[PDB]
Design an enzyme around this catalytic site. Sequence first.
Site, PDB file in Angstrom:
ATOM      1  N   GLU A   1       0.841  -1.205   0.000  1.00  0.00           N
ATOM      2  CA  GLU A   1       0.000   0.000   0.000  1.00  0.00           C
ATOM      3  C   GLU A   1       0.872   1.250   0.000  1.00  0.00           C
ATOM      4  OE1 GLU A   1      -2.981   0.341   3.021  1.00  0.00           O
ATOM      5  OE2 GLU A   1      -3.925   2.092   2.033  1.00  0.00           O
TER       6      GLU A   1
ATOM      7  N   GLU B   1      -8.761   4.958   6.606  1.00  0.00           N
ATOM      8  CA  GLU B   1      -8.044   5.248   7.841  1.00  0.00           C
ATOM      9  C   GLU B   1      -8.925   5.920   8.884  1.00  0.00           C
ATOM     10  OE1 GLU B   1      -4.431   3.585   6.338  1.00  0.00           O
ATOM     11  OE2 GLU B   1      -5.666   3.571   8.164  1.00  0.00           O
TER      12      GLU B   1
ATOM     13  N   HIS C   1      -7.049  -1.618  15.202  1.00  0.00           N
ATOM     14  CA  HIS C   1      -7.054  -0.788  14.000  1.00  0.00           C
ATOM     15  C   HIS C   1      -6.996  -1.641  12.742  1.00  0.00           C
ATOM     16  CE1 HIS C   1      -5.480   2.867  11.625  1.00  0.00           C
ATOM     17  NE2 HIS C   1      -5.500   1.851  10.781  1.00  0.00           N
ATOM     18  N   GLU C   2      -6.005  -2.529  12.659  1.00  0.00           N
ATOM     19  CA  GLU C   2      -5.825  -3.338  11.459  1.00  0.00           C
ATOM     20  C   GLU C   2      -7.038  -4.235  11.226  1.00  0.00           C
ATOM     21  OE1 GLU C   2      -2.819  -1.189  10.384  1.00  0.00           O
ATOM     22  OE2 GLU C   2      -3.844  -2.701   9.175  1.00  0.00           O
TER      23      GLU C   2
ATOM     24  N   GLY D   1       3.348   1.206  11.021  1.00  0.00           N
ATOM     25  CA  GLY D   1       2.922   0.576  12.260  1.00  0.00           C
ATOM     26  C   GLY D   1       2.486  -0.859  12.033  1.00  0.00           C
ATOM     27  N   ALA D   2       1.668  -1.080  11.002  1.00  0.00           N
ATOM     28  CA  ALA D   2       1.187  -2.398  10.580  1.00  0.00           C
ATOM     29  C   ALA D   2       0.358  -2.210   9.316  1.00  0.00           C
ATOM     30  CB  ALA D   2       0.341  -3.089  11.651  1.00  0.00           C
ATOM     31  N   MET D   3       0.237  -3.286   8.505  1.00  0.00           N
ATOM     32  CA  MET D   3      -0.449  -3.269   7.210  1.00  0.00           C
ATOM     33  C   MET D   3      -1.501  -4.371   7.154  1.00  0.00           C
ATOM     34  SD  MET D   3      -1.138  -2.152   4.285  1.00  0.00           S
ATOM     35  CE  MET D   3      -2.514  -2.866   3.418  1.00  0.00           C
ATOM     36  N   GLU D   4      -2.700  -4.008   6.655  1.00  0.00           N
ATOM     37  CA  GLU D   4      -3.935  -4.772   6.767  1.00  0.00           C
ATOM     38  C   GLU D   4      -4.165  -5.759   5.620  1.00  0.00           C
ATOM     39  OE1 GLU D   4      -4.412  -1.241   6.328  1.00  0.00           O
ATOM     40  OE2 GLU D   4      -5.678  -0.989   4.506  1.00  0.00           O
ATOM     41  N   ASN D   5      -3.110  -6.333   5.058  1.00  0.00           N
ATOM     42  CA  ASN D   5      -3.249  -7.383   4.065  1.00  0.00           C
ATOM     43  C   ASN D   5      -4.349  -8.363   4.438  1.00  0.00           C
ATOM     44  OD1 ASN D   5      -1.036  -6.454   2.536  1.00  0.00           O
ATOM     45  ND2 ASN D   5       0.264  -7.285   4.183  1.00  0.00           N
TER      46      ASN D   5
HETATM   47  O1  LIG Z   1      -2.781   2.210   9.008  1.00  0.00           O
HETATM   48  C1  LIG Z   1      -2.028   1.918   8.150  1.00  0.00           C
HETATM   49  N1  LIG Z   1      -2.600   1.452   6.905  1.00  0.00           N
HETATM   50  O2  LIG Z   1      -3.998   1.384   6.762  1.00  0.00           O
HETATM   51  C2  LIG Z   1      -0.498   1.988   8.336  1.00  0.00           C
HETATM   52  C3  LIG Z   1       0.021   3.027   9.362  1.00  0.00           C
HETATM   53  C4  LIG Z   1      -0.569   2.865  10.781  1.00  0.00           C
HETATM   54  C5  LIG Z   1      -0.776   1.600  11.358  1.00  0.00           C
HETATM   55  C6  LIG Z   1      -1.328   1.477  12.634  1.00  0.00           C
HETATM   56  C7  LIG Z   1      -1.680   2.620  13.336  1.00  0.00           C
HETATM   57  O3  LIG Z   1      -2.238   2.521  14.617  1.00  0.00           O
HETATM   58  C8  LIG Z   1      -1.479   3.875  12.769  1.00  0.00           C
HETATM   59  C9  LIG Z   1      -0.927   4.004  11.500  1.00  0.00           C
HETATM   60  N2  LIG Z   1       0.137   2.076   7.018  1.00  0.00           N
HETATM   61  C10 LIG Z   1       0.295   3.114   6.168  1.00  0.00           C
HETATM   62  C11 LIG Z   1       1.006   2.577   5.011  1.00  0.00           C
HETATM   63  C12 LIG Z   1       1.496   3.214   3.691  1.00  0.00           C
HETATM   64  N3  LIG Z   1       1.702   4.660   3.635  1.00  0.00           N
HETATM   65  S1  LIG Z   1       3.080   5.435   4.314  1.00  0.00           S
HETATM   66  O4  LIG Z   1       3.197   6.804   3.791  1.00  0.00           O
HETATM   67  O5  LIG Z   1       4.356   4.847   3.863  1.00  0.00           O
HETATM   68  C13 LIG Z   1       2.783   5.438   6.120  1.00  0.00           C
HETATM   69  C14 LIG Z   1       3.102   4.496   7.123  1.00  0.00           C
HETATM   70  C15 LIG Z   1       2.665   4.860   8.450  1.00  0.00           C
HETATM   71  C16 LIG Z   1       1.979   6.093   8.528  1.00  0.00           C
HETATM   72  C17 LIG Z   1       1.335   6.841   9.726  1.00  0.00           C
HETATM   73  C18 LIG Z   1       1.455   6.412  11.044  1.00  0.00           C
HETATM   74  C19 LIG Z   1       0.830   7.147  12.056  1.00  0.00           C
HETATM   75  C20 LIG Z   1       0.095   8.284  11.738  1.00  0.00           C
HETATM   76  C21 LIG Z   1       0.014   8.648  10.410  1.00  0.00           C
HETATM   77  N4  LIG Z   1       0.614   7.931   9.474  1.00  0.00           N
HETATM   78  S2  LIG Z   1       1.958   6.659   6.932  1.00  0.00           S
HETATM   79  N5  LIG Z   1       1.189   1.288   5.283  1.00  0.00           N
HETATM   80  N6  LIG Z   1       0.664   1.014   6.456  1.00  0.00           N
HETATM   81 ZN   LIG Z   2      -4.790   1.886   8.844  1.00  0.00          ZN
END
Ligand SMILES: O=C(NO)[C@H](Cc1ccc(O)cc1)n1cc(CNS(=O)(=O)c2ccc(-c3ccccn3)s2)nn1
Ligand SMILES: [Zn+2]
Length: 912
Positions: free
Chosen positions: A149, A342, A319-320, A283-287
């Site tokens: 993502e 988000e 969250h995920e 933080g984590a990715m929701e695959n």
């Molecule tokens: O929630 C997601 N996806 O749904 C995660 C991020 C996440 C996961 C768990 C949480 O409790 C909070 C945020 N995420 C984004 C991406 C790709 N975009 S990124 O620009 O590289 C980026 C990474 C993290 C970013 C962040 C982090 C805190 C605030 C604002 N932003 S922003 N991949 N995974």
């Molecule tokens: Zn998210």
Amino acid sequence: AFPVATNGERFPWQELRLPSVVIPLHYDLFVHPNLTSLDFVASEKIEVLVSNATQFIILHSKDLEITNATLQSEEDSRYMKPGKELKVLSYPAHEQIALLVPEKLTPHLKYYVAMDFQAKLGDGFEGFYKSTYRTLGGETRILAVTDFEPTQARMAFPCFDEPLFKANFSIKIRRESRHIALSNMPKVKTIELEGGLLEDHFETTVKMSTYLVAYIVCDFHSLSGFTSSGVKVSIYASPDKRNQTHYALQASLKLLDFYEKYFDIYYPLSKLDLIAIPDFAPGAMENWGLITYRETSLLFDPKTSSASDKLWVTRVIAHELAHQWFGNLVTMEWWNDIWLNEGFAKYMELIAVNATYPELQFDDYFLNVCFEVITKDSLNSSRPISKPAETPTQIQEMFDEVSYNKGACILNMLKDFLGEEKFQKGIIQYLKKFSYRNAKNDDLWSSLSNSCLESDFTSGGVCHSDPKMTSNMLAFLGENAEVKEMMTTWTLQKGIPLLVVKQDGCSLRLQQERFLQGVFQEDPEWRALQERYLWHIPLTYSTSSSNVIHRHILKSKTDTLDLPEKTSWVKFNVDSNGYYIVHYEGHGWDQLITQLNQNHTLLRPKDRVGLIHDVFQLVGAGRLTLDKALDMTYYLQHETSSPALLEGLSYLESFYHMMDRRNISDISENLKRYLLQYFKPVIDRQSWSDKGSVWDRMLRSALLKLACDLNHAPCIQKAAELFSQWMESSGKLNIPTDVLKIVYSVGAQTTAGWNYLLEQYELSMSSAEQNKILYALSTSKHQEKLLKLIELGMEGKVIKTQNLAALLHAIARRPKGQQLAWDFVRENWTHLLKKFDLGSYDIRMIISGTTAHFSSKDKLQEVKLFFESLEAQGSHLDIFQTVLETITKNIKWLEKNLPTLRTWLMVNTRHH
Ligand SMILES: O=C(NO)[C@H](Cc1ccc(O)cc1)n1cc(CNS(=O)(=O)c2ccc(-c3ccccn3)s2)nn1
Ligand SMILES: [Zn+2]
Ligand SMILES: *[C@@H]1O[C@H](CO)[C@@H](O[C@@H]2O[C@H](CO)[C@@H](O[C@@H]3O[C@H](CO[C@H]4O[C@H](CO)[C@@H](O)[C@H](O)[C@@H]4O)[C@@H](O)[C@H](O[C@H]4O[C@H](CO)[C@@H](O)[C@H](O)[C@@H]4O)[C@@H]3O)[C@H](O)[C@H]2NC(C)=O)[C@H](O)[C@H]1NC(C)=O
Ligand SMILES: *[C@@H]1O[C@H](CO)[C@@H](O[C@@H]2O[C@H](CO)[C@@H](O[C@@H]3O[C@H](CO)[C@@H](O)[C@H](O)[C@@H]3O)[C@H](O)[C@H]2NC(C)=O)[C@H](O)[C@H]1NC(C)=O
Ligand SMILES: *[C@@H]1O[C@H](CO)[C@@H](O[C@@H]2O[C@H](CO)[C@@H](O[C@@H]3O[C@H](CO)[C@@H](O)[C@H](O)[C@@H]3O)[C@H](O)[C@H]2NC(C)=O)[C@H](O)[C@H]1NC(C)=O
Ligand SMILES: *[C@@H]1O[C@H](CO)[C@@H](O[C@@H]2O[C@H](CO)[C@@H](O[C@@H]3O[C@H](CO)[C@@H](O)[C@H](O)[C@@H]3O)[C@H](O)[C@H]2NC(C)=O)[C@H](O)[C@H]1NC(C)=O
Ligand SMILES: *[C@@H]1O[C@H](CO)[C@@H](O[C@@H]2O[C@H](CO)[C@@H](O)[C@H](O)[C@H]2NC(C)=O)[C@H](O)[C@H]1NC(C)=O
Ligand SMILES: *[C@@H]1O[C@H](CO)[C@@H](O)[C@H](O)[C@H]1NC(C)=O
Ligand SMILES: *[C@@H]1O[C@H](CO)[C@@H](O)[C@H](O)[C@H]1NC(C)=O
Ligand SMILES: *[C@@H]1O[C@H](CO)[C@@H](O)[C@H](O)[C@H]1NC(C)=O
Ligand SMILES: *[C@@H]1O[C@H](CO)[C@@H](O)[C@H](O)[C@H]1NC(C)=O
């Protein structure tokens, strides 16, 4: 002319958005990664449907060598097996490839597009990339993991890399006998190939967007359990860390249940996997079916993880998991509406944690999410929640405090308006309606405004089945369109309204105006940023007499309600649930403060933290002199709700740190005194133990940290005692988790302690511990050590580089470090760019993490110059403006209210 290809021909297509003539229905994808060569060989067969006749197919591909390209068909007999060869031209500027066909294609006929491609495993947090962990024995071991993502799917297989191009996915993966392979959906079959290799065949997928595809090859272990729904949930981690997965399992089962009931929608897959990846940027990715985490997000070990840490780990699993519906089952139409994922996910955190772990007290912590995002909406540089975005880099920028929190706060603001029931029934009517396809911003308000209550009421009542014409339905359809209007105002207007309240005896004059930080009201800059900004703010207020909650919807720039009892004070935005700041003219601000010093229990506890927040934010606006915000903390002596206590304090603690970093010794030395005394009572009650409630524990941490930063002689004595006791035990005696970070950072202040700490960073099996050790390591006074930490992080062998970003920030916030960090960034910007995507979250926190705190006219110009230099080359990010406005906001705040701080603290020492 128009685009030119790598071979110097032409691209049939000129925009970076894809063409909607060919649309994909199914991906037969095969991946064979060799993990000791660190490269991969792959192939794919895309069942496409063409709607309008064409000469050319357009896909995304990036950094992918394509070595075969055919076209077959079973509906169009010209491309009958084997099929004619295609010829591909790569246009690397849009990350597009063009497959060129011999003969015009036929509308309404399905074709199969087949490609063989290969590439080296990426080495940088995106695509199909390499990752290393450490075993307990000292061995080092490799895995390969995907992260896609938003737009890096195109870096591992050629495809139509936009959400909305939703397809089914079929994955086969080849592996050595010592690895396992996971992907989105459970494994059907494992055929044994002849040389001793293995081919894992995965159940093919439901329709889903490309960025969600995942595959992994590794040697992790796992704990499994089942939901009441029948899903197999399995937490996967490094072999030795398996202990630490137990709570992940506990919480995710309880949560997955909760979500299924609350949405009235079963989880569609049969498995759900949580894996803890050692190298992982987000933080984590929701695959879908295969959620990936930083270990700090998922793993929990009780001897070392703090109780705060458990709250954190519970939050991200919340969250995920929420994304499974909000994100995967229903995906945004395009990256403008990314908040549709988000925003909703950040918010479900709250409902789901509160529902399933009331003991985790997460409802008292949700105002921080809004408060933080508010200080960025107090600047002009802020965007709205839905904003156009087109290039990769803009899309990445779209993941920020705005998309996440403003979206989550206005949601929770909506719920208070409509009520939990009518809010839940609108959510279900949306996830059910858009299942397995996409939705744009407007679609969401539509199904939330046309929400029915108590099911269909009476089948044939007030809802769509055989309805009854009643003067209720004309206001229901009227109230339905009312709310769809009001929200669209919140989603496309940047910034946040400030409501002005004047009490003139039974008459309240209401005014609204965009709230602005580091800009006063009497200014040339202020009445030109009040352009056209007007919101439908659903108000709420309680008066000093009755606890009644009145509720009015201000849709105008001025409005006047009539107070009947006309009593002592009136508190607007009760419990603070509404996205807006209230400022009281007249003696309003004076009535409320006296109420706080007399009882203070006559205002509900959320009202208080709103007030504390509202108050200080308004001296940032010039609308209140600093001595009325400080005068409020006097009641904190009696305050018993920890949230209000900790908000009060932090504001005071912000100032102390603002006074350092500059040499403002006399003031800093008085803040130290007004804290250590006058909060002496409560500090002295604090155990050095993990005993108590979650907010009890949180407050112990907060407080004992405060006194040990302020060199309070006892505290630093006891934290030292625990530290040398720990080191003279060779790690045999345990330190209570809640003072664990404090003890390490007290011990770090000496080269012994420090060097022992660095040595044990490399040996710890608890990434919660390592994180606390790093902080301590970062608090060293010597710049020799601080820099060694910095370089260690660049290398990425000892301190993994995913932490560099956060490490730089810890250093820069502390005075003996702010310069070292800022110098390092400027002296290495090129070098730092080879490691991270400008616009990655890592870059944006290195940039603001070393500049935001600056507050002098000199430092500002270093930055404006440094930023200007960056723009010169291929560089531009919104974070540039927001940093500037913020430093500016600080310069203005210093010069407007510093003498008042100075003078307030002097006065206080006299009266007591
Ligand atoms: O929630 C997601 N996806 O749904 C995660 C991020 C996440 C996961 C768990 C949480 O409790 C909070 C945020 N995420 C984004 C991406 C790709 N975009 S990124 O620009 O590289 C980026 C990474 C993290 C970013 C962040 C982090 C805190 C605030 C604002 N932003 S922003 N991949 N995974
Ligand atoms: Zn998210
Ligand atoms: C990724 O790529 C790596 C290499 O880069 C692959 O690793 C190699 O895999 C091949 C095939 O699996 C291996 O080749 C075979 O090695 C045999 C030698 O093994 C010795 O082992 C013990 C030592 O304790 C001895 O007892 C034994 O007699 C050998 O001396 C060869 O003898 C093999 O040839 C014979 O057997 C095969 C098997 O059926 C027959 O087909 C042949 O006709 C022949 O009679 C064969 O050459 C190689 O050893 C591996 N190297 C390493 C370092 O592991 C990975 O498999 C690959 N992974 C993926 C997922 O693609
Ligand atoms: C691609 O993914 C979609 C999901 O988005 C698949 O659609 C689903 O297909 C199945 C089977 O065709 C449907 O299952 C149902 O099962 C019961 C069991 O007895 C049966 O009686 C029903 O008539 C129905 O077939 C399911 O409803 C359907 N879901 C959706 C949302 O369309 C599709 O099958 C996948 N395509 C491929 C080629 O795998
Ligand atoms: C966090 O979880 C708690 C536990 O459910 C939630 O509290 C509950 O909220 C519901 C709806 O707001 C309450 O129902 C209503 O309560 C009032 C109280 O007088 C009553 O008059 C209404 O007619 C209705 O019954 C429920 O009682 C309440 N439970 C408790 C123990 O307080 C809370 O809302 C959750 N927080 C969030 C933000 O979701
Ligand atoms: C700040 O305001 C609160 C709210 O009025 C004060 O708490 C209240 O204090 C009064 C006594 O001054 C309590 O009255 C007592 O009520 C019981 C029955 O509930 C009655 O049997 C006794 O004879 C007595 O009259 C009142 O209950 C109490 N409120 C609650 C909810 O317990 C608080 O003391 C004030 N702060 C001060 C005065 O410093
Ligand atoms: C793709 O094909 C469709 C259908 O052949 C085109 O839709 C027609 O567009 C004309 C243009 O004004 C209309 O008068 C017709 O009524 C449309 N018919 C249908 C069935 O949609 C469409 O314009 C084509 N677009 C492209 C980009 O090729
Ligand atoms: C492409 O496919 C043809 C099919 O006959 C095959 O002979 C050729 O080796 C393939 N190219 C590769 C594997 O690079
Ligand atoms: C994990 O749990 C088992 C069972 O008590 C124990 O043998 C093992 O030593 C534990 N490891 C850690 C690091 O707690
Ligand atoms: C404030 O933002 C608006 C729109 O984003 C822009 O036109 C204006 O230039 C900004 N303010 C300044 C001082 O540049
Ligand atoms: C603060 O003032 C003292 C007084 O001489 C000076 O030695 C010290 O270096 C100053 N600190 C900073 C950061 O300028």
